[PDB]
């Protein structure tokens, strides 16, 4: 009860994000093994059945939250669930603000919903692993790398669809989901873009079949690429701080002749 007085104050009608205060308490509850995971989500999916956006947005953002900073126990029982938010029709007709929230509503839900289906489909949180030339992306074997990356591909898609312009930021409650989402954004393209990597090194030695798909996956992750950019483009503009915005520039996106070429000469007599 403690908690879901806490879910309560995460997701009041005030017009503003959650309260750090009330975020860090249901932290910390993901970190007791006492505490009961499917009563928190509870709390929180109760929360989005309310009529108001502000109300159901709080309780959206409060949900990612965790699944950023809370222990892994709580995206993990996420992604056990058949279902997850069921916001696909909702609407606030309270006001205009609650037609304008309405739709970012349903893209965010769609999101964290999809977060939840990577999650239980590779059984890794994509955005927390380890990097690097030794991490979990740069490691894969061919088989599970074909597999993955077309999952972190479909994440990001959902990500991207959130679709917000600079001039929608308008209100802290909005504003609170964006900073998150950009969060995952650069972390999850770091994934993607190891994932690439990982392809390019080992493409010219994969089965015909294989690299149908590894060219496949190339083909949309250059096109992902030009929307990571824009989506960047608006954190620029609406003021995020310079150095916390990823270089894309290092990205390997010059290959896509090379992978064709090598794929029509398998496709030869």
């Known amino acids: 009860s403690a908690v879901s007085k806490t879910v309560c104050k995460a997701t009041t009608h005030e017009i503003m994000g959650p309260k750090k205060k009330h975020l860090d308490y249901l932290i910390q509850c993901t970190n007791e093994m006492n505490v009961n995971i499917p009563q928190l989500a509870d709390s929180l999916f109760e929360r989005t ?9 709080k309780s959206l953002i409060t949900t990612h939250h965790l699944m950023v900073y809370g222990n ?24 205009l603000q609650g037609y304008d929230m309405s739709t970012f509503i349903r ?53 991207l669809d959130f679709n917000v312009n600079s001039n929608e930021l308008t209100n ?7 900073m998150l989402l950009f969060k995952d954004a650069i972390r999850l ?19 015909k079949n294989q690299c149908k798909e590894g ?22 503009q609406v003021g ?11 990205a390997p996106s010059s290959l896509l002749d090379a992978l064709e070429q090598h794929l029509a000469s398998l496709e030869g007599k």
């Not at 059945?49 to 947005?57: A, C, E, K, Q």
């Not at 892994?72 to 992604?79: G, K, V």
């Not at 393209?189 to 010219?204: C, D, M, P, Q, V």
């Open 49 to 57: 059945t309310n009529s108001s956006w502000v109300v159901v947005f």
């Open 72 to 95: 892994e126990r709580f995206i993990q029982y996420l992604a056990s669930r058949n279902t997850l938010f069921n916001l696909s029709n909702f609407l606030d007709k309270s006001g």
């Open 107 to 159: 893209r965010y839900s769609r999101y964290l919903n999809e977060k939840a289906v990577s999650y239980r489909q590779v059984a890794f949180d994509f955005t927390k692993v380890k990097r690097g030339a030794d991490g979990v992306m740069r490691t894969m074997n061919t088989e599970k790398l074909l597999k993955t990356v077309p999952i972190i591909q479909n994440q990001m898609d959902a990500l």
């Open 172 to 178: 802290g409650v909005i504003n609170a989901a964006f």
């Open 189 to 207: 393209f770091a994934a993607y873009n190891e994932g690439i990597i990982n392809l390019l090194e080992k493409y010219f030695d994969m089965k």
């Open 215 to 236: 060219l496949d996956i190339y083909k949309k992750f250059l096109t992902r690429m030009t929307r990571i950019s824009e989506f960047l483009k608006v954190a620029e």
């Open 240 to 250: 995020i701080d310079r150095g916390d915005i990823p270089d894309l520039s290092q």
